[PDB]
Amino acid sequence: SEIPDDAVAVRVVAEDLSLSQGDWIAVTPPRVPELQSVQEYVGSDQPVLMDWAVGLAFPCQQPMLHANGVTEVPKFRISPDYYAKLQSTDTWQDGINGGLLGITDLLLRASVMSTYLSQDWGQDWGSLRKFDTVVEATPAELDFGSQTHSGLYSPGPLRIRP
Amino acid sequence: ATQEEIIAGLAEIIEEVTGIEPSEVTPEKSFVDDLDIDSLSMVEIAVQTEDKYGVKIPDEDLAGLRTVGDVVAYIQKL
Amino acid sequence: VRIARWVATIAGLLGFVLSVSIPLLPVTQTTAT
Amino acid sequence: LTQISEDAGKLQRTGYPDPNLRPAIVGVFTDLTGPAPQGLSVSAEIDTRFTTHPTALKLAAMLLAIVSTVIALLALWRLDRLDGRRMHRLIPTRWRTVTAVDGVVVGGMAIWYVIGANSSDDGYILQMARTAEHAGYMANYFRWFGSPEDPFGWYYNVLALMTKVSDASIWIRLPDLICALICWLLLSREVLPRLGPAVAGSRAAMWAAGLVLLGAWMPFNNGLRPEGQIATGALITYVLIERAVTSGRLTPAALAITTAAFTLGIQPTGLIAVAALLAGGRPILRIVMRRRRLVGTWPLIAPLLAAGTVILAVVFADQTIATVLEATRIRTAIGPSQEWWTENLRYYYLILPTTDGAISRRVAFVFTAMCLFPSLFMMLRRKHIAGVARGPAWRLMGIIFATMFFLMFTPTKWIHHFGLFAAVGGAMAALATVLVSPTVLRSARNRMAFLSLVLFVLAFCFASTNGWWYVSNFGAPFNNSVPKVGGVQISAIFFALSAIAALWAFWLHLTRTESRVVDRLTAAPIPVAAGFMVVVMMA
Amino acid sequence: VLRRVAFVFTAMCLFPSLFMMLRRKHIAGVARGPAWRLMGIIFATMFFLMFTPTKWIHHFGLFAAVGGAMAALA
Ligand SMILES: CC(C)=CCC/C(C)=C\CC/C(C)=C/CC/C(C)=C\CC/C(C)=C\CC/C(C)=C\CC/C(C)=C/CC/C(C)=C\CC/C(C)=C\CC/C(C)=C/COP(=O)(O)O[C@@H]1O[C@H](CO)[C@@H](O)[C@@H]1O
């Protein structure tokens, strides 16, 4: 919307007028991307691992739900903005203290893919990471047997610390 | 019942439960036409009159009798 | 009269002992291997 | 085989003995292919300890406990109905007035319900409620090892069965509107006329009560964090203990016991309910002693202990006590301890799971420190104030002062989340704006000093940024900086107004008490302060 | 220029003494004034000042003296 309708050609123009070591830039030829909204791309069937900060803004995508001890394998990791993610969310969930990220970074590769908030370019809504598995595999058969009755005993102490 | 003792006690309970100083309480002033009580706050004073005086107040005369002659004329009619 | 007074005590503290005995009761765990 | 380089017994069997090193099973991964060989198996029983459901015996005992305490409260209600008082005229004549304040509170809690700011961990509680139907045990989804939020957490099951319908942000958030219209309908109809004839005869008292309810409700309780339900729990148990104090009965006291028990269970910050229960301990005990003559002690306090422990029938519905102990130590070991939340409420204003620290401390310095302390001082200083009825006011003061040393910084280490006493701090503020009214404070000095305190605490409230949490501040008037108007900050100009009022009070200290400009300026300073805060949040 | 032993025991001795001095309204044993002054200091350094403002929380055991006299008054 900044460039007018008769504008036809663009050319990236850069400068590094700062001679210190920590001042450098890099570029890439410009692209007009094929933009799809998140609800169109991520459906309501592919299970995502929503971070806890962003659950109310994304009320339709089905989260990865755990059934008697195993979870679904997630395919996306919809997350809050960068400072709240780095200092407030992924430190609230990892394999050190329980967490959900302890069973995603051990199994899946997370790669960030590009998102833009529509019509408000310039605000970090969050980030949408696309998981993919390191090796191709299948959900387990997981034969379960019930009726291990109990009084008030625990089977044994849970793993909490090394 | 010496017409002043009882009145003073009923004003000590109006002050304890309703929270009104013993000045507005006269026969000329009452629950709903002059002073300000309510239907459920007046059961508190009703049950306190049943407490310090053995006077089992009917549920219809409580709502029926409107003024503060209600509380005097009933403790002096055992 | 005395019926309602009897029903307030028995099956009142029976409710207390049942409501305190709920955590120490059998549950059917579903184990998975 | 054996070992080559000692024999170490008579086998090659070696390994550590410490049962804290175990695998983190994610799968059973390999890189050899073909048909499976005989004698090859890898088996692991996964720890499905929490995923249970009760047997027929436990379900029968649960149903018998529920129906037995319903029978014993109905028998109690037939027992204490022996003073011949019948509950005629439902929705009394005290209730059927509609004031102009309901157009500010009901039509102001609907505009804020649609467009307002959600809480910090609304996504956390929605996410651990959307998956608990398939898991079946109300899992604390994110942090603690799949251990449940069930040492208490019955309330999230209501959201779990509430996500059967569509789970948008306007429909799962409905228990913080229904519990915002049975707070206010109990705050203007059943606890302000209970608080005396001055708080009900005035209109500024009911106005500041509504505006402080709105201004303490709108930042915190609007999300999905159940602190609005703790507000409605404390208010229901307070009016349900006071109704029982007035009419002398005991079944509203037993219902207040079970409601303070229930809304202890919603959150571990629900100790305002048991503080409200404890504050009416002497009047409940004197009610028991009054009815101790006609009916004996044993049919009187047995439904109290019956309706006190039925919270355990909803809390322990599908969690064993050993399972709950293993679920609560887990948070205690790897969890945030009480020394972890203290250096996490100032540093970078990071989103934390169950807390608001910007707004909480900024919401709770004003609306329970400029209307708590002056009303407290004018309460206990003047022993016989004219309009305010002592005993229903001191019990509410005891609720506020008990919860400040019962829950906050004792037993749980949550920082100030002001959304607890959004309901009962409304009635508290009504007490304050009838305790600095001109009919009770003859001194213009002592009113102008309080107006200086109001302007100072409103300046301190505007001191920090105007910052909402995650997507509520997508667009704000002052998103990053301090709110400033006309170059200079609004904090500095309210500091200057505080200085002007303090100098006008110190100047009137020596002249001493006319009533020309001071009576028009300090008449009801609480609703104008709270209304400015409400309209700046809404704007 | 431009928490379980240290506070909770002090609260568990503070809460009875205020109610006893409120209900009795003059005590035969303890003197009237500087009792209420020791109340004023402890009851003001517990909250509005150090809890409402929130000025550098968790310097836990700093009622080494006045909490001692509070336990003595208890
Ligand atoms: C004379 C007579 C009989 C009555 C007259 C007297 C009168 C009128 C009144 C007196 C009262 C009365 C009547 C009683 C009669 C009735 C009577 C005899 C008693 C009634 C008393 C009342 C009013 C209620 C009773 C409550 C009862 C009996 C049970 C309540 C339910 C609970 C809590 C049971 C506890 C379960 C057990 C055994 C242990 C649980 C441990 C616990 C409670 C706390 C420890 C666990 C912790 C620390 C959790 C904190 O963990 P975290 O780190 O804070 O985690 C955060 O959670 C969020 C996640 O989103 C995030 O913020 C964080 O992750």
Numbering used by the authors:
A (entry chain A): 921 to 1082
B (entry chain C): 3 to 80
C (entry chain A): 23 to 55
D (entry chain A): 164 to 168, 170 to 676, 678 to 704
E (entry chain B): 488 to 489, 525 to 596
Q: What does the primary publication say about this deposited structure?
A:
Together with the other Emb proteins (EmbA and EmbC), EmbB belongs to the glycosyltransferase C (GT-C) superfamily, whose structures comprises an N-terminal transmembrane domain and a C-terminal soluble domain located on the periplasmic side of the membrane. The EmbB protomers in the two states share common structural features which include two periplasmic domains (PDs) and 15 transmembrane helices (TMH) arranged into an approximately crescent-shaped bundle.
In this study, we have determined the structures of a substrate unbound EmbB2-AcpM2 complex in a presumed resting state and a donor DPA-bound pre-catalytic conformation which we define as the “active” state. The whole of the DPA fits into this part of the map with the arabinose moiety and phosphate group fitting into a charged cavity just above the membrane surface. For instance, the phosphate group is coordinated in place by R495PL5, while the arabinose moiety forms hydrogen bonds with E313PL2 and Q431PL4 which themselves are further stabilized by N304PL2 and Y320PL2. The last seven prenyl groups of DPA extend to the other half of the hydrophobic groove via extensive hydrophobic interactions with I421TMH7, V438TMH8, I448TMH8, I468TMH9 and I469TMH9 in the membrane space, with the end of the tail interacting with F670TM14 from the other EmbB protomer. Another structural rearrangement upon DPA binding, by comparing the structures of the two states, involves α6 in PL5, a short α helix that interacts with DPA, whereas in the resting state, this region is disordered.
